[PDB]
Structures are given as C-alpha cells and as structure tokens.
C-alpha cells in the first residue's frame, strides 16, 4: 500500500511534467502538420479553379 | 532462473504475427495510398498552376 | 564453512566487474558519439535532423554491450551458475 | 527481497510452461496496437485534415520508408516497411505501458506489478529477434538462391575474414535480443529497488526514473526497427 | 566457524565498489567529452549555444543515466545483497 | 576443510566477470569511436551516408567479434567450467 | 576463527578504494578534456573567454558531481559499513 | 585442508579471464580507431577504398594478432594449466 | 587464526593502492590532455602563451585537486584505518 | 594447503595481468598508429611509400613492449620465481 | 599463520596497484603531450624552442604524479604501515 | 601455512600489476607519439628529419616509465621486500 501510494504520487508528477512541457509542443507539431495538409488541399482547390477560369478565358478569346 | 527460454516464446510470437498481419493489411497499404495520393495531388497542383500560367498568356497571344 | 557463501561472494565480485566494465564502455562510447553529434551540429546547424539517425544507431551499438553485461550480471547475482 | 524473475500466472500446456504475465502483457499491447490500427482504418482521409492517429501512423510509415529507401530500395524490399513499423509500434507500446501506476505492495514487503513490460522476459525478445533473423536470412535466400546467400554471408564484404563474418552473423540476433532485454530488464529492477523507499521519498526517484524510461523505451523501439531494416538491407544486396 | 554472511557481505562490498568505480569513470569521461564538444561548438558558433544544448543534454542523459543505474545496483549489493544467507 | 568445486566455481565466476567487463569496455569504446567517424562523415557529406555504412559496419563487425567471442568463452567459464571436478 | 567484522571491514576498505580510484580517474580525465576544449577555444578566440566559462562550468559540474558522489559513498563504505554487525 | 588443484584451477581461471579481458579491450578499441580512420578517409575520398583497405587491414591484422595470441594463451591457462599438480 | 587487525590492514593497504593508482591515472592523463591543449594553442598563436595559462591553471588545479584528495584519503586509509580495532 | 599451489595461483594471476595489460597496450597503440597511417594514405596516396617507415617504428615500439611482457609472463607461469 | 605475511601480501598488491596506475598515467600523459609537441613542431618549426617551455611544464606535472606514486610504493613495500 | 607462500603470491600479483600497467602505458603512449609522427611526415614529407628529435624525446620519456616499472617488478619478484 505504502509503495503504491508513493508510486502513484510519482506517476502524478510524471503526468504533470508531460502535460506541462511535452503536450504543448507535440500538440503544436500536430496542428502544424494539420494546417499544412489543409493548406495543400486549399492550394489544390484554388489551382483547379484557376485552371477552369483560364480555360474559360481562353475559350472566350 | 530467467534467461532460459520457455514455451511463452511461441505464444508471444503468435501474437506478434497477428499484429504484423493487421499492420500489413490495414495500416501500411492505406497509409502508402494516402501518401502517394497527397504527392500526386501536390504535383497536380503545380502542373495546374503551370498550365494556368501558360494559358493566360496563350489566350492573350491568340 | 558454507560453499554457497564462497560461490555467492565470487558471483558478486564477478557481477561487479561486469557492471563496472559495462558502465565504463557505455559512458565513454556515449560521450564520444555525443561529441560527434554536437560537433556536427555546431559546424552546420541544419543537420540537427539528419544526424540523429546515425547517432542513435551508434548509441544502440554502444548500449548493446552495456545491457548485455547488465543481463549477464543479473544472471550472476540472481541465478548464480554452478551454485551448489 | 527484490524477487527477480518470479513470473506470475504461470501455466502448462502440452508439456510446455508459459509465463501468463508476459502473455497477458503482450496481449494488452497487441490489443492497443490493433485498436489504433482499426481506429486509423475508420478515419483514413486522403481528402481531408488528417486525424492525430493518422498523423502518427503516417509519421511512422514515412520514417521507416525513408530508412528503407536510404538503405535498400522500396521496390526491392516492400515487406520490410510493414515489418519495421509493426516492430516499432509493438516495442514502443510495450515499453510505454509500464509508465502506468500498476505497481503495488505484495503483502510481503516486495513490490509487485500488475503489468510488467514483456520485453523484460527473454521469451519476448527472443521471439522478436529470431523472427527478424529468419526473415532477413530468408530474404537473402530469395535474393541469391539457396546457395549464393550462405556463400556471401560467409565471405562477406572481404573474403579472407570469413571466420569473423560467421561470428558477426551469429551476433546479429543475440545483440538484437539481449540489448532490448537489458534495457527493459534493468528498468524493471530499478522501480522495484525504488519501492524500498518510503512513499514520501519513493515518489521522487520513481518519477525521475519513469520519466527517463519513457525516452529509453522510445529509443529502444527506434533502434530495433533501424537495425532490422539495416540487416535486411545487408542480407539483400547484389 | 566463520560466518558465511561475512564473506557474502565482503564480496558484495567489493562488487559495489567495482560498480561505482566503473560508473564514475564512465560518467566523468563521457561528460568531459560531451562538454569538450559543447565548449568547442560554442567557441566556434556562439549563436548556436542554445541549439547545441539539445544534443548535449541527450548525451548527458544517456551517460548520467547509466551512472545512476550503477548507483542503484550498488545500493542493492550493499543493502539487499542477493544470495545473502 | 572446504569443497574444491566451490573455490573453482568462484574463480570461474570472477574470470567470466573479467572477460565480460573487458569485452564490454572494448566494444563500447570501439563502437563509440566508429560511430563518431560515421556521424562526422554524415554531417559533412549527407549523400555519403550510403557509402559510409559499408566500411563502418565492417569495423563494427570486427569490434563486435571480440566481444561476442569473449562472451562465448565466458559461458565456457560459468557453464562448462574447465578443470571443474 | 576470524572476526566477521574483520572480513567485512577489509571488503569495505577494498570497495571504497575502488570507488575512489574510479572517481579520481573519471574526474581527472573529464576535467582534463573539458579544460583542453576551453584552452583551445581561448587560444583561437582570445575574447571568447567570457562566454566559454559558462559551458565549461557545466561540464565540470557534471564531472565533479560524479566524483563527489563517489566520495560520499566511500565515506559510507568505510565509516558506516552496510551489512556490518 | 583443500586440494591444491582447486586453488591452481581458480588462479588459472582468473588469469585467463584477465588475459581475455585485456585482449578484448585492446581489440575493440584498436579496431574502432582503425575503422574510424577508414570511415573518415572514405568520407573525404570516396574513391580511396582500394588504396585504404591495405593499411586498414594491416592495422587490423596486428590488432587481431595480439588478440588471438592472448586467446591462445588463455586456452593454455585454462585447458592445460601450467603448474597444475 | 589470524589477527583481525592483520586482515583489516591488508584490506586497507589494497584500498589505498587502488586509491593512489586511480588518482595517478586520472592526474597523468588529465594533465597530459591539458598540456596538449596548451602546447597546440601556443604553437598556433605565439603570443597567446601569457593568456592561456589561466584556463590551463584552472584545468590543472581541478585535476590536481582530485589527485590530492585521493592522496589524502589514501593516507587516511593506510595510517588511520577506519574500522580497525 | 600446499605452498606450491598458492604460489602457482598467484603466478597465474600475475601472468594473466601481464598479458592483459600487454594486449591492451599493443592493441590500442597499433590502432592509433594505423589510424595515423590510414589517414596519411587517404590524404595523399603516394605518401604510402614513405609512411610505412615511421609506422613500422611506432609498431616496433608498441609490439616490443607487448612481446617483452609475453616473455615475463612465461617466466611467471613456466619457471615461477620463488616457486618454493 | 603470521599476520605479517598477510600484511606484506597486501602491501605488495597495493604497491603493484600504485605502480600500475603511475605507469599508465605517465605513459599516456607523456604520449599525449609529445603528440602535441610533434604536431606543433611540424606546423611551426620556428616554434621548436618556444614549445618546450609549456611541454616541460606538462611533463613536469605528469611525471610528478608518477614519481609521487613511486615514493608511496616504497613506503608500502619497505616501511609497511601497520606491521605487527 | 608457510608465510613465504603468501608473500610470494602477493609479490607475483603485484609484479603482474606493475608490468601490466607499464605495458598499457608504454603501448598507448608510443602509439600516440607515433601517430603524431606519422601525421607530421604525411603532411610535410621533408619534415622527417625534424620530427625525430621530439619523437625520440616523447618515446624516451614513455619508455622511461615502462622500464622503471620493469626494474621494480624484478625487485618485487626476485628480491621480494619483506620476504620471510
């Protein structure tokens, strides 16, 4: 029991350290990769629309 | 003693094998397809930008 | 006297030798590999990423010795071979 | 009292002993990995914002594929990618599941862990290492016949060092297993040793050691995967 | 008539001394080498100081750790001697 | 009086410990040095990595051999103790 | 017919000697290597001295600590010997 | 009251362990250093393998000659113990 | 039937020998490395001899402090043996 | 306890120490000299022709120190001084 | 059994350890300092004399430790502290 | 048992330690000095004549320690102090 309590306090310390100083940077990395993928999708969509508009203009001319 | 191999050696192996199977059939092929599609999408975006750039000039020329 | 006592003393000394040698090797090899890593990063900082793979390969090759020694020390002092 | 070894849930079958605790730990790790894999398979999106699980899985796949392509082309050795990724995730989850607070007092003053990292059992590391050994030797056989492979491994890069090469080939599996074993085995002892302290003093060294053990397990999984890939590359050449 | 526990304790003390001597040698020399790399890097590129501390503390982390592991196994030997009668 | 086998076994354990300690020191330091060479070569020539593994591992091969050879003989000391009655 | 405390004290003294020998080897060599880096840095950049003393003290701090821990345990070995009776 | 062969065998085992520990240290570190030279050279000059493998293998031959002479003398110590009676 | 003080004194002598051997190894190698840095710096920069003695003296002071602490504790071991009745 | 047994055990331990130290020195010195030779040949190939001269001196000073130990080790084990 | 025998054996082992450490330290430190001296003289021949002032100092330190050990080894083997 | 046996065993172990340490120091120091010499001759072929004078000093110093140890080893083994 005593060693269980001590180990549980140690695990609480570990979790506090992880959430305080490890979760933020890794969460930021995940957000950065997600935003990179979303921006790539937006680039694809806007480039497709740009090609459509250019084709329409060329057909007009 | 603890360094002597046991029958567990087989059991663990079996588990590993099935995990590998899953990873071989439902993780790596889908992920490879996703990565390849993303790369092809980036290449297609670049190609579409290039075609738009040349067409906006060709239409004015013609 | 007890033969097992003499065998246990010998096993303790042998395990001490094993762990001391392993610690020496691990510490010095890790220091050397980290020196290479730090020098490479200082020379050209943007290799921060590409250097870690060979560095950790080196670390693994170094720690192999240390932890094989740790395993055999545990064998020596917890399941002593030839203990009557 | 530290009680090194002393596996629990030991049972028998077909005149063979099985350490139930290690089987249970391996099963829990496999369940976690399979749950992650199926959560991915229900969330893969090539046309959307990736989820965290997809991000992790594709990061692992990218790392392993980069290593393979650097060593031996992917087209030459496609299977090495699934093998390496599964080895990595298996070892990493097995090691990191030990951080959870599953240690308690066994009523005899000796700490007992409900979950013990399976890599602290020689059977687990031996299974992984020997599977990798057979796998890359079979790959070398497929590459250079039943004959050229033993010939080339015996002679190696330089023929006149044939004896050393043989030893080297025997050192590849053992070094793969024992290394991992030790890395985890030692850890299992350290926590047990830290259990001898009173709680008000136990909490601190235990916290420090387990925080470091997280990185230790990550590095061990990475090293095992890298060495598996590189042994595959060596076994498949020319 | 010599007490076997005495011989076991003497052997345990010698083994613990060996463990700690090896750990001290490894820690001192490894930390010195890593610090040599750090000092040379800071001398070469002062503005890289911070970005050098990342590998440094990794190396120290992999060196000092081993030392303290030895420390634990020393305490064992001299506080819970395996095989003690 | 005393059991001769006990003395022989204690001697064998100490000898095997010496064998493994020496092998550990040699392997660790040699692998560290070879890895230092590899890391420097990669830091200076990224693309050279592919051609650096061929010599590197050759080195490591030799460096490993001794170690494991020692390990083998250590087994002969502690499991097939020569001269044991 | 030997006093158990005599055997335990001899073992403790040998172990403490090993502890101090290893600690001194590590401390001396690590300090020498760190100082070699510091001296080279100051030689190449005479003005760098100011900053170089920061990482240097870290290295020494990581080396001397390993020494002074050994010291402490040696004091434990030869003044409050574990396992004595 | 003990068999002299037991003391002689324990001494021979410890001596052989010392021989192999020293041989392993020398072999590992020497091979590591020679391989460091080889790896660095191939890093600088990718086409130097043909010319470099000669001096590298001369060095490895010397180092392994020392190691295997030690191994042969350990075999003599342990299997045919000089002075055994 | 040996005097307990005899065994204690033999153990103390061996421990002091270990202390002094380790201290000597550390001191010699650390001083050699520091002097290597000093000589190289003076060779490269002729007029840096005056200003290089500060870091060199710091390094040599650390190394000699380790050595002489070891010497003092060897004197303690051999001339006032702890645990000697 | 036969005095010759104790003396022979001590002689065997001493010879083992002698050979272990000799091998450590020989291996590391040969490795360092060979590192110098390999680096020199890598920097310029023709220099090989001359480089073997100092190299053989270095190895000559290394192996010699080893071989002397060998002889003395033999003296320890085959004709033990003070064998009584 | 004569306690002086045990004390003398311990003193001889201790003196051997002291000389082993002294020899290792002296040899390696002198080798390193001489490596620096040779490299510097190769780089800056005009500095041949200039380098000898620091080099000797280095040697003066290294050898000093060695010889101190020698003195104590005598105190161990000739006037053994603790004979009785 | 005979005090001579214990003293001779201790002397043999001490002499083995002396010679092992001497061999380690001599081998490694000679290797390092020869590495310096080989690198210097490689970079500057014409410097071969100039580099011997430092190299023979370094080696000399290194060898000194070794042979001094050798002498003391004999004193340990053939003229064992404290023998009785």
Author numbering:
A (entry chain d): 1 to 61
B (entry chain b): 23 to 84
C (entry chain L), J (entry chain O), K (entry chain Q), L (entry chain P): 3 to 86
D (entry chain a): 10 to 247
E (entry chain T), F (entry chain M), G (entry chain S), H (entry chain N), I (entry chain R): 2 to 86
What does the primary publication say about this deposited structure?
The membrane domain of the mycobacterial ATP synthase is embedded in the IPM, with the catalytic F1-domain of the enzyme extending into the bacterial cytoplasm and attached to the membrane domain by a central stalk and a peripheral stalk (PS).
In the current study, the concentration of BD employed was almost an order of magnitude lower (25 μM instead of 200 μM), and this lower concentration proved to be suboptimal for the detection of the BD itself, as the drug was present in only a minority of particles. Therefore, in the various states and substates (see below) the density for BD is highly variable. However, in the current work, by combining the membrane domains of all of the particles, bound BD could be modeled in the same position as previously reported in close proximity to the N-terminal region of aH5 of the c-subunit in a position that would inhibit ATP synthesis. This position is the “lagging” site. In the mycobacterial enzyme, this inverted L-shaped half-channel is clearly present, but the water molecules that form the Grotthuss chain were not resolved. The mycobacterial inlet channel in the a-subunit contains the polar residues aHis12, aHis15, aHis16, aAsp30, aAsn104, aGln112, aAsp117, aGlu122, aLys125, aGln192, aLys219, aAsp222, and aGln229, which are probably involved in the coordination of the water molecules that form the Grotthuss chain. The proton inlet pathway then passes through a small aperture between α-helices aH5 and aH6 formed by residues aGly196 and aAsp222 into the interface between the a-subunit and the c-ring. A gap leading to this channel is plugged by residue Gln7 of the b-subunit and another, between aLeu111 and aTyr124, leads to the membrane and is presumably blocked by lipids. Polar residues aHis146, aArg153, aLys161, aHis166, aAsn174, aGlu177, aGlu178, aLys181, aSer184, aTyr240, aGln243, and aGlu246 are found in this region.
